[PDB]
Write a protein that holds these residues in place. Structure first.
Motif, PDB file in Angstrom:
ATOM      1  N   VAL A 193      80.061  78.415  99.341  1.00  0.00           N
ATOM      2  CA  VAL A 193      78.946  78.756  98.440  1.00  0.00           C
ATOM      3  C   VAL A 193      77.856  79.658  99.032  1.00  0.00           C
ATOM      4  N   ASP A 194      77.604  79.540 100.333  1.00  0.00           N
ATOM      5  CA  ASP A 194      76.493  80.269 100.964  1.00  0.00           C
ATOM      6  C   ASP A 194      76.833  81.747 101.180  1.00  0.00           C
ATOM      7  N   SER A 195      78.058  82.014 101.629  1.00  0.00           N
ATOM      8  CA  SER A 195      78.540  83.376 101.884  1.00  0.00           C
ATOM      9  C   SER A 195      79.380  83.923 100.729  1.00  0.00           C
ATOM     10  N   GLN A 196      79.755  83.037  99.805  1.00  0.00           N
ATOM     11  CA  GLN A 196      80.624  83.348  98.669  1.00  0.00           C
ATOM     12  C   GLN A 196      81.980  83.938  99.069  1.00  0.00           C
ATOM     13  N   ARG A 197      82.464  83.580 100.255  1.00  0.00           N
ATOM     14  CA  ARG A 197      83.681  84.171 100.798  1.00  0.00           C
ATOM     15  C   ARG A 197      84.862  83.204 100.713  1.00  0.00           C
ATOM     16  N   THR A 198      86.026  83.749 100.368  1.00  0.00           N
ATOM     17  CA  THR A 198      87.263  82.978 100.225  1.00  0.00           C
ATOM     18  C   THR A 198      87.714  82.394 101.569  1.00  0.00           C
ATOM     19  N   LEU A 199      88.139  81.136 101.538  1.00  0.00           N
ATOM     20  CA  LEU A 199      88.728  80.470 102.692  1.00  0.00           C
ATOM     21  C   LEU A 199      90.202  80.127 102.373  1.00  0.00           C
ATOM     22  N   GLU A 200      90.662  78.969 102.848  1.00  0.00           N
ATOM     23  CA  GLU A 200      92.056  78.498 102.735  1.00  0.00           C
ATOM     24  C   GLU A 200      92.620  78.395 101.311  1.00  0.00           C
ATOM     25  N   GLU A 201      93.923  78.657 101.178  1.00  0.00           N
ATOM     26  CA  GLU A 201      94.633  78.476  99.912  1.00  0.00           C
ATOM     27  C   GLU A 201      95.085  77.025  99.702  1.00  0.00           C
ATOM     28  N   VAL A 202      94.918  76.532  98.474  1.00  0.00           N
ATOM     29  CA  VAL A 202      95.325  75.180  98.083  1.00  0.00           C
ATOM     30  C   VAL A 202      96.360  75.208  96.947  1.00  0.00           C
TER      31      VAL A 202
END
Ligand SMILES: [Co+2]
Length: 446
Positions: A193-202
């Motif tokens: 939420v803070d950086s609005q950047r995508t992380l791991e795939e679920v």
């Protein structure tokens, strides 16, 4: 063990001679002995949060709190969105809980809840490759109570930005970013939420409704109808009826929660699995009576606003006689500080207060009290300390009197006459005279 666990509906066991962190050790033991979940009823919120951290030290079973709304009855404000998320998660999983400890303060346990059938009835799951359009998902989210924002920052929000939909599911720690190709979900990814950047795939996610009540068109119509059966309607736009009718949830709307449902709100007890064992501390009757009185005072003192007429307390909270009526269906362990007399249902467990171990840090004979205790006590002694770091404000200090605490994360590892070190929230120590073990927390030294 010096006591059996109760099993029959209404069957009590009273355990006495408890002090300090002993209660936490006992709830941990009971959860380990009992095949089934344990619900721990604490007298109030301060004790429930203390017991959460303390019990966690002494078991690897899950320890959870049913989060209270943390507003006062008939509050002008709505609960913090993180609290609602936590509550929805806990309530949703409660009926299938197999093991562990759920801690519920008296005030919380007396509050009626949405029926589990609502949570499941408004839940949504979705999978990668599953046939969902971004437009189709949005319409479900709106009916489920979710708030359309430009940028997702909190629980119960979603954002539709181009070919993507972001959402922060109630009941989830993380938010998710979904991309759509050909009206199926191309992917789901945690994002920050803070950086609005995508992380791991679920692979898949589950969402719960955005509130503990329905807010769709049908529920608004129900709310209006049930509001009219109960109260007057004024024309003023700040009237609750007017606000909800326009699709606006006023602050503090939670205290008209019953009006969104066609049946009375059940007790929390309706969620408990049949094999649930209850445990409680303190004086449940005096705690329950104090809450009941407190909730009536809120009703009487806040019921004078023509825009916000209040539902009677019985619509949201169990009466005290109702609470004890529900309690009769469950076996219960009562944990008591006092030494009990001999009775069929009673066992004393042998914990006594530590002696005066206080330091006079202005050095004369400073650690003389700790010294004489350690030389005299011929069972294991386990020092307890709040951090992995300050295990050495103490631990480097204990090397000064030839004590080099070995370290464990289990009380049952403390054999013979060893000195030991434990990290956790245990506030005050004890001497278990039955097992011949002492726990010493930092607070007993200061
Ligand atoms: Co006696």
């Amino acid at each position: 063990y010096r006591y059996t666990l109760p099993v029959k509906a209404g069957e009590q066991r009273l355990l006495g001679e408890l002090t300090g962190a002993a209660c936490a050790t006992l709830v941990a033991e009971i959860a380990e002995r009992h095949a089934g979940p344990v619900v721990l009823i604490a007298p109030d919120m301060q004790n429930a949060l203390r017991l959460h951290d303390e019990i966690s030290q002494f078991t690897d079973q899950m320890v959870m709190n049913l989060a209270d709304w943390e507003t006062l009855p008939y509050d002008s404000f709505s609960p913090h969105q993180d609290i609602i998320s936590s509550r929805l998660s806990t309530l949703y999983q409660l009926p299938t809980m197999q093991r562990g400890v759920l801690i519920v303060p008296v005030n919380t346990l007396m509050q009626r809840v949405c029926p589990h059938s609502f949570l499941h009835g408004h839940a949504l799951v979705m999978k990668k490759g599953q046939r969902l359009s971004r437009d189709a998902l949005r319409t479900q989210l709106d009916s489920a109570g979710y708030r359309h924002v430009d940028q997702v920052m909190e629980h119960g929000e979603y954002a539709t930005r181009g070919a993507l939909l972001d959402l922060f599911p109630m009941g989830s720690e993380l938010p998710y970013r979904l991309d759509f190709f050909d009206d199926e979900i191309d992917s789901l990814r945690v994002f920050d939420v803070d950086s609005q950047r995508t992380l791991e795939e679920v692979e898949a996610i589950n969402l719960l409704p955005a509130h503990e009540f329905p807010t769709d068109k049908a529920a608004i119509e129900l709310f209006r109808s049930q509001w009219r059966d109960t109260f007057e309607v004024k024309r003023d736009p700040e009237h609750i009826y007017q606000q909800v009718s326009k699709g606006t949830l006023p602050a503090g709307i939670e205290y008209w929660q019953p009006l969104f449902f066609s049946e009375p709100l059940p007790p929390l007890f309706s969620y408990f699995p049949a094999n649930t064992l209850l445990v409680n501390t303190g004086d449940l009757e005096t705690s329950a009576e104090r809450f009941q009185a407190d909730t009536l005072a809120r009703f009487e003192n806040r019921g004078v606003d023509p825009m916000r007429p209040l539902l009677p307390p019985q619509s949201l909270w169990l009466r005290v006689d109702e609470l004890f009526s529900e309690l009769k269906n469950w076996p219960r362990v009562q944990l008591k500080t006092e030494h009990l007399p001999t009775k069929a249902a009673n066992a004393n467990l042998g914990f006594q207060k530590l002696p005066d171990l206080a330091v006079q840090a202005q050095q004369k004979a400073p650690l003389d009290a700790l010294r004489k205790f350690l030389e005299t006590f011929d069972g294991p002694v386990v020092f307890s300390v709040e951090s992995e770091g300050r295990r050495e404000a103490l631990g480097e200090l204990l090397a000064r009197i030839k004590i080099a605490p070995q370290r464990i994360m289990r009380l049952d590892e403390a054999s013979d006459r060893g000195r030991y070190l434990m990290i956790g929230a245990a506030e005050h120590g004890f001497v278990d005279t039955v097992r011949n073990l002492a726990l010493i927390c930092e607070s007993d030294l200061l």
